[PDB]
Amino acid sequence: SQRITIDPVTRIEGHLRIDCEIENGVVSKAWASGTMWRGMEEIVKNRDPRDAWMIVQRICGVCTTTHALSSVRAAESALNIDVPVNAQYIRNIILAAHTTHDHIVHFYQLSALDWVDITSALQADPTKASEMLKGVSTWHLNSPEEFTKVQNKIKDLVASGQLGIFANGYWGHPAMKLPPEVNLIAVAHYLQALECQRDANRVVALLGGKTPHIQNLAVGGVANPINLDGLGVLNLERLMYIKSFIDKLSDFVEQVYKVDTAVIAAFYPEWLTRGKGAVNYLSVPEFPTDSKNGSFLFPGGYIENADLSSYRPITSHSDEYLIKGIQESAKHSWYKDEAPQAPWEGTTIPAYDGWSDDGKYSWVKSPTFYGKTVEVGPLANMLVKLAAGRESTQNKLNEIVAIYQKLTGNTLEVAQLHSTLGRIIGRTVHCCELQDILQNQYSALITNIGKGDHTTFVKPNIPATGEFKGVGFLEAPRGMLSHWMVIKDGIISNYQAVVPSTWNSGPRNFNDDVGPYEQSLVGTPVADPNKPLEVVRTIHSFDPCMACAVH
Amino acid sequence: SQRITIDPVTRIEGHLRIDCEIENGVVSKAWASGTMWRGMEEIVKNRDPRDAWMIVQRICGVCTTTHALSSVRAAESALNIDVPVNAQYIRNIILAAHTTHDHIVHFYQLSALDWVDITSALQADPTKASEMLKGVSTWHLNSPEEFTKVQNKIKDLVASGQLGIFANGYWGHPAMKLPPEVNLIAVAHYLQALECQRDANRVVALLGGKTPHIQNLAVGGVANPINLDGLGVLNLERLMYIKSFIDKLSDFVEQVYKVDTAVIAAFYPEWLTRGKGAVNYLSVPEFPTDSKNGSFLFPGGYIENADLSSYRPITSHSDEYLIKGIQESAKHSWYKDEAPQAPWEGTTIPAYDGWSDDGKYSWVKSPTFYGKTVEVGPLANMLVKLAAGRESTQNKLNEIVAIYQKLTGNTLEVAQLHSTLGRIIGRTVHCCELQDILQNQYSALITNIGKGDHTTFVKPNIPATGEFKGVGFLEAPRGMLSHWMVIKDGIISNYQAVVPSTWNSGPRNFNDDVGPYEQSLVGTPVADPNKPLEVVRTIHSFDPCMACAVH
Amino acid sequence: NPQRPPVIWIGAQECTGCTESLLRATHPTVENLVLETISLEYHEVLSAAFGHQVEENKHNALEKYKGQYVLVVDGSIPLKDNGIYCMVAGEPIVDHIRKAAEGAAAIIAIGSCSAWGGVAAAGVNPTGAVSLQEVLPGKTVINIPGCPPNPHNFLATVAHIITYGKPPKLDDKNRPTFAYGRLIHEHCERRPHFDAGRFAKEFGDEGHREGWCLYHLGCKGPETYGNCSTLQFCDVGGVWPVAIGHPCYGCNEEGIGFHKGIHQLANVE
Amino acid sequence: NPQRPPVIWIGAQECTGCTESLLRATHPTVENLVLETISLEYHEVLSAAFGHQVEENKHNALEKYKGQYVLVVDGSIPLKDNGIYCMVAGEPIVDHIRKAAEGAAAIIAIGSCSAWGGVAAAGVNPTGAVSLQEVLPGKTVINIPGCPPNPHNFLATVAHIITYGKPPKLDDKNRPTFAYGRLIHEHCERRPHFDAGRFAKEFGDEGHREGWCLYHLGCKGPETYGNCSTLQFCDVGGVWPVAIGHPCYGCNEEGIGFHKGIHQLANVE
Ligand code: SF4
Ligand code: SF4
Ligand code: SF4
Ligand code: SF4
Ligand code: FCO
Ligand code: FCO
Ligand code: F3S
Ligand code: F3S
Ligand SMILES: [Mg+2]
Ligand SMILES: [Mg+2]
Ligand SMILES: [Mg+2]
Ligand SMILES: [Mg+2]
Ligand SMILES: [Mg+2]
Ligand code: NI
Ligand code: NI
């Protein structure tokens, strides 16, 4: 075989190394390695439970908001606090708007240059490019004039001899399949995406106090003061401003990102037949809307051996079957204790001894669910919604499939979603459905305030003795997140984060079973082992976040 | 034969009445009337000269900034103060950005519905509309998809049965000549204009402290504290923000407003042969760039009997020829003192006695220059620049003419500019050239601060005895503005504003000579005397502002 | 495609700056205001119709929407000499206003001129200009002062009427508390400098160039109710007169703006 | 189409929030930053190249632009166990940083992690995380703290280096004075409430819902240098933690953020 290393993997969050053995141009075995650790679990220990969320939010700034929200949910779980419904609406709007920005940036700024060749875009006929989209999109910024302006910006950059972020990209690689015209379309959309994601984060900022790293949470609810008639607080004028940004997201999401997802799939049909990482999938329900931390707008569940028809629904963040199943192992990770650990009893004891193919090779732990490897994130999330018979999800997928069918003459079956492109599709479906979440929760907030409920915060009490345990689940952009807090004598005695990229990127486990990234790469063709674009395509479909994975 | 009244004239600033005698289907005689007075000259009397600008800025909120700037320049004239060059750069940026907003809103929100039929736009083919602009514009928001979205908004408004500001418009009038497609183009641009004008006013706001009604001036300079390294003052971050908005204006101005101007001319070429208001024109130089209230970027001058070749240049705001020529009469105005008055000796004594065709019929005074009626504003301004041989103005006019030529196969000569459409063209040319003013003055400010000059303000002294006369000239969106201040014993003993719409809108003068509005209407064909659209088309071309005209 | 709440806007002795405030708004933008939020049944600055046609629109709308429309007035109303200082279609504006007021669901004075007389009623008051409340003594007039106010002080007042079916809470001058409930000086970011005696003495001086308090330049924040330091202006961030370097002039507040000199010192409570 | 000033960005123990701040920027936007303002010669979050290709880009840039590039680092640098807590291309990140620093025209620590250790160096400091300055004792590191800072605190620093040829004025922690020269509490719009003893006691209480001072909720404004109350965040107007209802946590300031509890009271000068 030949042995390659990809280090650093770029266009992810954080520090990733991927190694592959290649046999006759086909990946036979792979290793995923998170190469940076901070010890954020140990840093937060021995503090007041109320302080955790501000600290652990810094696990990641790409998936900002997520660890903050999981941490307060964990403390509320431990303390048995029911969050005020207004606090849930506000948390929900933040998470949905955040995730909109996140997914858009992943598709365009992080992933598009795996599939798109900017050199080829310079050869495009901008008018032919525009005409290709007639009857496929109603987006208002697909004109030949827009595309020519974009083409000229690329031309100018190439001409400068200072290619910067585009230098030494995979231009003319044999796995680049788009015609010039579609390459130019995608670059134009890449630039337009930046405005849409900016608007999404204006929503986040107006409730969170800023982004990155929101500052409006509390164990017990939120710090936003609801008062329609108050100066300097969350009044009707402020809410109207929030709404003005919510309303700006939908057109790009539906007429650009959704469409490009189908267009990419149409030109790369082999990528429906590789990059399967697992046969089990997990998601948690999300966006609670009652006064008791439930009544979620999105459903969760567990699929085993790819069988949607027999999946197990999860409708509560207190589900004992979900809680009891989760363990992590450090057999092949740089920690001391190797046997599977339930997170309330987890340790994180560093034991770096360098790279070994058969020993320890990552700072990521290996999570299992009742002993099995599981993929999390948008593929899981979409499949669970389909298994639930959620019509909104079916319908949205069907819209992507209809565009794909128009371009290719072919449909897509669910079997084909267990793939690199299926994973990308799941993420797009999520982004689309989140726009209805935003409308729904903004309307719910306005209605509730109108009824006279301005409550936002229930002040916790924390017993100064005794030992008690909580867990906060969250369906993050990259999948199921859980923070596990043990409180003893009023302070955090254990804190364990089990993060979605931990599930997907973790190394071989206690039984030497292979997790999603590593499994997904088996079978990948590598045309040029010096430039393994095909490996990076599949890895990027998981939206790696290694600050998240490792913490 | 018959007599009509148009009252109110809408889609102007303020309160205007126009009366016309119609004979053999053509206007034979017209009256222009300003029907509201406040007495702003009297309100500001007896105050400290330094206070005037904040009060008299409220002469007008459409041409906000202008009376504030004119007022400080008048006090500075009286007191012999040389304004710091940084204060000039800031004043200039404000005036240029304001005027960009002002002209855009005039062409679209105030004037386009004279020429554009929204009902006809509903019958357009959006694809044909887009195709019509190929090789005429490079604007990125002329797609069929953009135009379809716009058409659907019109459709929905009409379907609602609540037409609001579009209700009872001149839809189907025989003087409406655009094809459905061009109607739809115009309405799309109307909506797009609102974004561009908002960006222009963001420039104004960041230096003025808000708009409408800036709050950064002083007799002696400006209140902006320049400190690249200072927190909470005008630092490099703030300057970069200003620049980000300046840069957003050009494309719409050049690729939409400029082009639409040529398109309207191409479909309405008879409107190059009517609406001449005067044979004399006046403008003042504007945008001073030296340390002594001079070195203007735009030239000024006086044209008599339409002879550009023998015009008199005006290069100084202290030019005694300009100062000594200006008088106002109230013979046909509702004031007591009727003989021509130099503004330093002006009175404004109300003497309302109702309407008489041959007596008093307006709150607007009648200005003359050495006893002659004069047109001011963008037509004057453009013609003076052409007389000066300003290449930038020649070149910009030529661009408009080249589009007109491509559309019609005909050219435009300077003789055809003395017309309703010529006036409109002058305005467009001004807006275009102001974008280079903004780039020039931003760069000048950055450069000057870099040389270590952070000076912005020279504190005035005002002698407690003596009588001092000052005049502040400004080339406003609607033409030459002048504020005339007399200081006696430390306070304002006389204040007289002679405003551009005074020149143009003022009634018959001491010698019963006819001013621009009234002159311009003679010969106007009126197809339907009950719906005199053609009259309002010519009156709008002057961009009336009656709070300005009357004060 | 539902019906939208009707609005009648009448300008009296106005400078048009109150209408112009709408062109800076972002939530809603003026285009979304007129297409989505309201039906602007009469507004002389933007209406296609003129003359007889626009007076037709007004009469039709007053009848069609009797009891339902919001009436908005900018500018002062001049009573001297029997109303002749503002005449529209041959009749005193005070008559047009009183007629429209008869059938209004709500009445708003936008800007200091309609709210309390403003600059048009200052000094010797040449035209006998008065406020909208003064010409409508039997009606509750909602005052949104400022010259002009932040347009959202108006737009969120209208939105509260539409969305929740009543006006926002008002103070004892009938001003919405969300915008006018507090002195500017009781929520001003330069209060620390005031407290420490750190004051600009002249524009351009060292203190001014470090963003110190503008009290000694004449800041009227201590005697002006408003939201200028928090909501600020134009939605760009950091833009209000004091932040730019100039004292508050008190334009929101009767007896302050247009009465006191720029550099006259405020009373401090 | 001129040449643009080169930038090399290396991430150490970074959460990526400091890069992400750029995606909220408006002056310049991130797309104008990379196409117009600078040439971003190395940035692993955005670069098309990966692995051996991106390591080639770094080496080629370090040579081509020796003496000319701005080096930017986010995240802390872990010294414990000979650097192994952050390994890229098989080498400790401290070695990559020291190498890139040799040829830098200017060096910037963006964010509290690189400026003073930040969250990653808190508590027991599992990895022996330190600041950029600590690993480059012979260099003047410009510190732009915050978690993350407003991106224009960085962008205007870079623009000053480009436009005027030297760094902006710095305080004695090498922080740009335009952004960090004053305590938040010495320029906070809730100071009047502080002064009057008008305090929120709990989130959602009546004082909180009137926008009163957050001192008694643990606001660290009194002991944190920054521009959060004036520049604020995201350029929409009115948005910073305190304006949203939550105390400053002191994330800019060493020994405050990530050390003091949220609800622990600040010392007041
Ligand atoms: S309040 Fe001010 S802006 Fe409004 S009409 Fe009066 S003078 Fe004009
Ligand atoms: S006097 Fe003016 S600048 Fe000073 S604190 Fe009061 S309101 Fe602010
Ligand atoms: S300073 Fe804050 S946002 Fe920046 S890398 Fe450190 S934790 Fe992340
Ligand atoms: S304690 Fe905090 S909220 Fe209160 S005045 Fe100081 S910085 Fe502002
Ligand atoms: N999304 C996200 Fe970050 C990861 N993996 C978390 O949680
Ligand atoms: N422009 C403008 Fe207003 C008028 N006429 C002034 O000056
Ligand atoms: S002058 Fe007016 S706009 Fe605000 S800052 Fe003072 S009340
Ligand atoms: S927590 Fe940080 S972002 Fe500003 S408000 Fe306080 S320094
Ligand atoms: Mg963990
Ligand atoms: Mg001096
Ligand atoms: Mg006058
Ligand atoms: Mg209310
Ligand atoms: Mg400097
Ligand atoms: Ni993450
Ligand atoms: Ni005017």
What is the domain-level CATH number for residue B45?
1.10.645.10
Range list for CATH 3.40.50.700 in chain C: 3-179
Range of the domain at A324: 1-551
- How close is the nearest chain C Cα to the Cα of B45, in Å? 8
Confirm or reject contact between D152 and chain B (CB < 8 A): yes
Number of Cβ within 10 Å of residue C114's Cβ equals: 36
The DSSP annotation for A494-513 comes to: EEEEE-HHHHHH--S-TT--
Cα distances (angstroms) measured from residue A211 to each of A200, A482, D13, D152, D233: 11, 22, 20, 14, 8
Q: Please count the residues of chain A.
A: 551
User: Is the CB of C187 less than 8 angstroms away from the CB of A229?
Assistant: no
What is the longest distance spanned by two Cα atoms in chain D?
Answer: 62
Q: Helix A180-208 and helix A236-246: axis angle, to 10°?
A: 170
Phi-psi region of C255 (alpha: psi -120 to 50; beta: other; left: phi over 0): left
Rounded-to-integer distance, Cα C226 and Cα C112, Å: 12
| Residues within 6 Å of ligand 6 by CB | B 60, 63, 66, 476-478, 481, 499-501, 545, 548
Sign for the CA dihedral angle at A110, A114, A119, A123 comes to negative
| Contact call for residues B390 and B308 (beta carbons, < 8 A) | no
How many independent structural domains does chain B possess? 1
Ligand 11 geometric centre to CA of A4 (Å): 84
Rounded-to-integer distance, Cα C83 and Cα C79, Å: 5
Domain D180-269 homologous superfamily, CATH? Cytochrome-c3 hydrogenase, C-terminal domain (4.10.480.10)
Residues facing A301 on adjacent strands: A283, A313
Ligand 14 geometric centre to CA of B336 (Å): 78
- How close is the nearest chain C Cα to the Cα of B231, in Å? 7
Structure determination method = X-ray
Rounded-to-integer distance, Cα A228 and Cα A250, Å: 27
Residues facing B18 on adjacent strands: B6, B32
> A329 phi and psi, to 5 degrees?
-120, 150
Rounded-to-integer distance, Cα A145 and Cα A160, Å: 23
Rounded-to-integer distance, Cα A365 and Cα A498, Å: 9
Which DSSP category does A167 fall into?
Answer: T
- In A162-218 the beta strands, taken as DSSP E runs, fall at 217-218
Element (H, E) at A113: none
- Residue B250 CB-density burial (10 A; 0-12 exposed, 13-18 middle, 19+ buried): middle
* Sheet (strand A300-303) strand order: A281-283, A300-303, A312-314
Rounded-to-integer distance, Cα B206 and Cα B210, Å: 7
Distance of alpha carbon A429 from the chain centroid: 12
Rounded-to-integer distance, Cα C72 and Cα C91, Å: 19
What value, to the nearest 5°, has the Cα angle with vertex C9 and ends C8 and C14?
Answer: 165
Element (H, E) at A315: none
The tally of CA atoms less than 13 A away on the side-chain side of residue B77 is: 25
Tell which of D14, D73, D97, D203 to mutate to test the A interface (max A CBs under 10 Å): D203
Give CA torsion, residues B269, B271, B277, B278, to 10 deg: 10
Cis bond before residue A340 (omega within 30° of 0): no
| Contact call for residues B151 and B269 (beta carbons, < 8 A) | no
- CA-based end-to-end distance of chain A: 34
Q: Which of B60, B196, B431, B432 is catalytic?
A: B60
Structure tokens at B250: 């050009």
Structure tokens at A227: 């008062």
Task: From D20, D152, D214, D224, give the residue whose CB has the most ligand 8 atoms within 8 Å, as the site to mutate.
Answer: D224
Catalytic residue status for B548: yes
Confirm or reject contact between D168 and chain B (CB < 8 A): yes
Range list for CATH 4.10.480.10 in chain D: 180-269
Catalytic residue status for B67: yes
Rounded-to-integer distance, Cα A162 and Cα D41, Å: 8
Neighbours of ion ligand 12 (CB under 5 A): A 228-229; C 168
Residues 6+ apart with CB under 8 A from A117: A169, A170, A171, A172, A173, A176, A178, A183
Residues 6+ apart with CB under 8 A from A94: A65, A69, A203, A204, A207, A208, A214, A216
CATH no. for D3-179: 3.40.50.700
Amino acid at position B537, single letter? R
Rounded-to-integer distance, Cα A426 and Cα A434, Å: 12
Task: From D219, D220, D225, D230, give the residue whose CB has the most ligand 4 atoms within 8 Å, as the site to mutate.
Answer: D219
Cis bond before residue D192 (omega within 30° of 0): no
Tell which of B140, B141, B149, B195 to mutate to test the A interface (max A CBs under 10 Å): B140
* Residue closest to B456 by CA, chosen among B279, B224, B287: B224
Ligand in nearest proximity to the CA of D248:
8
Give CA torsion, residues A336, A338, A344, A348, to 10 deg: 20
Rounded-to-integer distance, Cα B147 and Cα B121, Å: 10
* Residue closest to A280 by CA, chosen among A298, A260, A301: A301
Rounded-to-integer distance, Cα B151 and Cα B126, Å: 8
Confirm or reject contact between D94 and chain B (CB < 8 A): no
Ligand 4 geometric centre to CA of A490 (Å): 28
Cα distances (angstroms) measured from residue B226 to each of A296, A514, B229, B449, C234: 53, 62, 9, 8, 21
* Residue closest to A132 by CA, chosen among A71, A191, A86, A178: A178
Ligand 7 geometric centre to CA of B310 (Å): 49
Rounded-to-integer distance, Cα A395 and Cα A423, Å: 17
